[PDB]
Structure formats: C-alpha cells, structure tokens
Symmetry: D2
Subunit: 118 residues, 4 copies
C-alpha cells in the first residue's frame, strides 16, 4: 500500500495573510513527496518519453497547519489503472502523527500525448 | 449559475522546470478569482466571525498552460448546501475561450470552529 | 532612460502572514516587468546562446504594499556596461504614482559561461 | 561574527522554467534562515511593538542552484547600526560548502512607524 513517508519542512512564507499554510502549498508538499520518492531508488533522476503527468489533484483540508510545524507526507496506492495511478495521501504533523492536516489523492497518468502504460 | 468570470494574468514565475504553469498555481488562480469576486460588490473588504474556509480543492488538469497566455477564471455554483457551497470552475484561455485548461471545483464552508449557515 | 512602465496585478497570495506583500515577491514583480518588456517589441519570444542572466538584485523596501492595490513597475537604464546592464526600478501604486513601494536595481549580464557583449 | 548556519531543503518547485532555482526564492531562503534563527534561543516565538522590518535585500547570484541540492545559509553581522543591522549571508551547498551560490546582505531596521533601538 505505502509508497513513501516523506518528511517535509514547512517554510514561514508557506503561510498566507490568514496565518495558516496556504491551500495551494499543500499541492506543492504532495509534489515534493512524489519527486523525492522517485529520487530514492537509485542514482540521478531526469527522464523523457513515456512520462508521468498529473491529471488531477483532490486535496481535503482537515485542520490548519502553522509554521514552524514540519510535516510528514505519506503516499500510498489508492487505485492502480492500466495507464493511471491514483496516489492517496495523508499529510501529518511530524511531532504527532495523530494530527491529520489533509488527505485525498492525486491522479497520475503516463501520456503527455496519448495514454500509454499497456 | 455563474458567480464570476475573472481575468487573471499569468506570470513567468508561474511555470515550473517542465515548461508549463505548475499544478499548485491553479489553486492560486482559483483563490484570486474567489476574492476578486467578493471584492466586487461594494466598498472595502475585510471581515470576521461567521467566515468561509476551503474544505477541499478538486482540480482537473486538461491541457498545459504556458506564459504569456493570460486566463479567464469562470466560477459557478455547482452545489448549494446548508453550511457549504461547492464552487465549480473552468479556467479558460483569454484569447480563445474554447481552450479549457482546467475544471473541477472547490468546496467552501462557513465554520472555522463549527459549521454555521443555518 | 526609461525602458518600460509595466502594470502588474498583485495577488492575494502575494501577502505573507504579516499582512503585506512578501519581500521576495518584489523580485518577482521586477522579473515579470523585464520579460513582459522583452515580449513587447515583436513576435514570439524564446531564445538561446548569448543570453541574459541576473547577477544581482538590490531591492529597497520603502513602504508596505497590500492587496488589492495593483502596481506599476518602472524600469530604466541606471548603468550601461560593456557586458552588463544595471536596470534601475521604481515600483509605484497604479492609482497614485506618487506612492513609492520600492526602488533599487537589478544587474543583468550576458554570459551563462563567460562574459560577452563586446 | 556568525549569527547562524541554517540548513534549508530546496524544493522542486523552487526552480523556474530555465532549470535553476528562481532568483526570488533566494530572498525566501534568507528569510527562513532569519526566522529559524530567532526561533532557536528559547520557547515559542511571536511578538509585537518594537519589531524588525527588512529595509533592503542585496543578493548576488554567483552560480546556479538546482534541485535536489539542499543548501546551508550562513548569516553574520556585517554592520551594526544604532537602529539597523546589516546581516551578511553566504548560501552554500550542503554537500560541499566550498560551493557558493550567493552572498550579499539584508538590512534590517526596528521601526514599522519610526526608527527605534536607541
């Protein structure tokens, strides 16, 4: 199920005028986790042709996140398609993983032209 | 149905290393449209107590957006709840509104403590 | 003297938790003005080889900027070197150009390898 | 001399379409270092009245920074004024501190009304 559990440091600039991390930054935390994940395996990462592109981001905001609380981004496989993968997520507080800031998923497809993974 | 059709200028910095506007920036375009919308009506805008908070952002990425193509963010009421409002959207190209960069919705609730709108 | 006077829309997300546009966003406003400027002249813009790179950004913050006040970015030639150009700037309020949010300059050089413009 | 040496993780989104971390993000790295610094000492941080505001950011870009190379932000006192402090900086590569991405300084003043620190 689990793909990765990536610790991400929150930045002061991540917050907006309302005093909490901006909604848009959540999509960025999920992005960092995905690429830091594909970076693990082995060696240097950069590639072309049959590649992944995000088709949709579905993010639920459960409770406000404030600096300086760093997070833990948990990624797992929610759905496995022939050409797509729906990566579910849980953004938790590093100091108390029982604190859930957000869940939802991101749908990834390998296309950038026409579908392809089968 | 329609709540607003807000023109938004894209910035060069909006793009990422892959050469297209970053997914996270889409949530920001939707945000700007919502507040520029609440700004129209009349007078200066800033308020407290029974207030709106985004519960979820569901954004579908249809085709890549590249600078310097400015957009038009169309917002409409997809669902009207007792305490929430699901604002549907269509991010179109200003020069050709037949070009759809993204659709989906954002769920807004008036709480920030406990639900309230009824 | 004057190179360009570019109107730039401020975004709500531009502000930080302190309630004013973040310092880092100023460098971005200057960036947008520079590229929107090189975009004017004629036709589509994208190029390689002898190209410009920013060597330094020297930005003075005069007074706080708050949404929804859009700005006017005035760019001019402060210094002309053999291989560099120091572009001075004045970020003013669109509704009252007597309101100065920031001045200073950005030093641009055509290198990205070794200096070259002579 | 030294005020702090703060490790900062670079994010993929930090890069722009040109394939290197955007100039504006450097000001943000310097910002994070300053607040993470004021956070060390002791206890929870948030304060009002005689407070610090950035009067100027003078950043020199020495060599391009690319993800996933995390950095080390070194802050030191370049100048001590009666009401201001000019914090010099050196943004280095975490894996090789001999790699200098940027230097320069940030001028901080305690005002937000009228000068005061004497």
């Amino acid at each position: 199920k689990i793909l990765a559990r990536v610790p991400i440091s929150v930045r002061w600039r991540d917050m907006d005028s309302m005093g909490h991390v901006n909604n848009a930054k959540y999509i960025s935390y999920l992005e960092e986790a995905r690429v830091r994940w594909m970076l693990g395996v082995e060696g240097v990462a950069m590639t072309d042709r049959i590649a992944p592109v995000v088709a949709a981001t579905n993010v639920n905001y459960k409770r406000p996140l404030v600096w300086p609380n760093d997070i833990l981004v948990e990624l797992f496989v929610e759905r496995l398609g022939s050409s797509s993968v729906t990566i579910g997520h849980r953004i938790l507080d590093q100091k108390d993983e029982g604190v859930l800031y957000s869940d939802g998923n991101v749908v990834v497809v390998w296309i950038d032209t026409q579908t392809g993974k089968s």
